[PDB]
Design an enzyme around this catalytic site. Structure first.
Site, short mmCIF file in Angstrom:
data_model
loop_
_atom_site.label_atom_id
_atom_site.label_comp_id
_atom_site.label_asym_id
_atom_site.label_seq_id
_atom_site.Cartn_x
_atom_site.Cartn_y
_atom_site.Cartn_z
N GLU A 54 1.92 3.82 2.92
CA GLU A 54 2.51 3.23 4.13
C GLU A 54 4.03 3.22 4.08
O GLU A 54 4.67 2.16 4.02
CB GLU A 54 1.97 1.81 4.33
CG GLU A 54 0.47 1.79 4.52
CD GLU A 54 -0.15 0.42 4.47
OE1 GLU A 54 0.55 -0.60 4.62
OE2 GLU A 54 -1.38 0.36 4.29
N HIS A 90 0.84 -1.19 0.00
CA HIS A 90 0.00 0.00 0.00
C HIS A 90 0.88 1.25 0.00
O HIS A 90 1.69 1.47 0.91
CB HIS A 90 -0.90 -0.03 1.22
CG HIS A 90 -2.01 -1.04 1.13
ND1 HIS A 90 -2.46 -1.74 2.23
CD2 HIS A 90 -2.75 -1.45 0.08
CE1 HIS A 90 -3.44 -2.54 1.86
NE2 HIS A 90 -3.64 -2.39 0.57
ZN LIG Z 1 -1.83 -1.74 4.22
#
Ligand SMILES: [Zn+2]
Lengths: 74, 306
Positions: free
Chosen positions: B68, B65
């Site tokens: 992050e 992701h």
């Molecule tokens: Zn994540």
């Protein structure tokens, strides 16, 4: 990337209010003072229906409006 | 201005770093390309370990992701710490001699770049598919594990969009292809996310528990204690569906259903004060404590081979 080096981040214009914008380069959009954002989206959240089971960012749920709450996907 | 282990690095710098670390440490690190992103960018994988016969492996990825950023920061920190301490601390020497670590520093590279120059809170990939003008699929809803059944959106514009089909994204197909091919050697799967300070095991696509559940729970309990040793950082732990939320199509569950008995998702600092925007000044402490956790798990896996 000056924006990120200084500890901020880039956002589309529509997601960074005028008072939060910064002059630093690095973005094809605009450099934003992220610490000054409010509301669900301003915290990396997504507004979802009340009956969606999630990890809710409760302090930002009111900003999502009717029938909606602030979820942060991790 | 160049790579640093205590700052967040743009992709071009991370990419350069993967080659550098291989060149500087030829006996311990080699680098591979396991595929290519939607936008055509090479996805790198590092193999950390000393040459040996029929070595078991632990697969760890970061950067599923985009927003992050502490996740890729940790994969980088792990590689340096492993080589720095090899032949100096007995535990790590043993680990690298008997095990390989596959370390995937950023999977979602298109997304990661996008957060650097355009939109800091982007999560998904940057793909386009026929049928929608919206962009991106959630790579951690895109695996063939109760695919798109609970805790996933069918709306292409949503952050938890599962995609048109399992492995629709080149990034997740590349990761799944790699693991499928190395299945007989991979004994643990570890996938690094943030934030919320948790250690999670299957299942997230349903409320069922693994055959292994008691052992997974005990291992998690023990590794979060070990993590808390350094700086007092408190992690919670449990099966994903009830501990974090329902979330079908996750890579942790998929890997576990392939037969990888030790499969965990880590959620690193913090608990929401900075969230995804973890300050650079916290990178070292976060990475140090996380390293203790990964080491603990790896040593456990070494004594529980199958
Ligand atoms: Zn994540």
């Amino acid at each position: 990337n000056e924006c990120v080096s200084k500890g901020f981040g880039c956002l589309p214009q529509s997601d960074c209010p005028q008072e939060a914008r910064l002059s630093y380069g690095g973005c094809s959009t605009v450099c934003c003072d992220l610490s000054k954002l409010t509301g669900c989206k301003g915290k990396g959240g997504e507004c979802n229906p009340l009956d969606r089971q999630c990890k809710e960012l409760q302090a930002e749920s009111a900003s999502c409006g009717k029938g909606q709450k602030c979820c942060v996907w991790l | 201005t160049g790579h640093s282990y205590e700052k967040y690095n743009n992709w071009e710098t991370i990419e350069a770093w993967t080659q550098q670390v291989a060149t500087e440490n030829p006996a311990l690190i080699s680098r591979s390309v396991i595929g290519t992103t939607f936008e055509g960018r090479a996805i790198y994988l590092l193999k950390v370990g000393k040459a040996g016969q029929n070595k078991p492996a632990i697969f760890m990825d970061c950067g599923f992701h985009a927003r992050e950023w502490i996740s890729p920061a940790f994969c980088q920190w792990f590689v340096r710490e492993a080589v720095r301490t090899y032949g100096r601390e007995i535990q790590v020497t043993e680990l690298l001699n008997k095990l390989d670590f596959y370390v995937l520093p950023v999977l979602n590279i298109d997304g990661y770049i996008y957060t650097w120059t355009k939109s800091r809170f982007w999560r998904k990939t940057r793909s386009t598919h026929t049928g929608s003008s919206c962009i991106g699929t959630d790579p951690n809803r895109n695996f063939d594990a109760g695919w798109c059944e609970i805790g996933a959106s069918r709306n292409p514009c949503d952050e938890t969009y599962c995609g048109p089909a399992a492995e629709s994204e080149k990034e997740t197909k590349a990761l799944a292809d790699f693991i499928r091919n190395k299945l007989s050697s991979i004994k643990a799967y570890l996938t690094i996310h943030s934030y919320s300070q948790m250690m999670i095991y299957p299942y997230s696509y349903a409320y069922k528990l693994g055959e292994n559940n008691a052992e997974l729970n005990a291992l998690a309990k023990a590794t979060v204690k070990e993590l808390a040793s350094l700086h007092g950082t408190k992690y919670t732990y449990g099966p994903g569906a009830t501990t974090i939320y329902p979330a079908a199509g996750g890579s942790d569950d998929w890997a576990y259903d392939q037969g990888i008995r030790y499969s965990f998702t880590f959620e690193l600092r913090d608990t929401g004060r900075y969230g995804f925007l973890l300050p650079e000044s916290q990178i070292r402490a976060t990475c140090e404590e996380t390293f203790l956790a990964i080491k603990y798990v790896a040593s456990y896996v070494l004594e529980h081979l199958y």
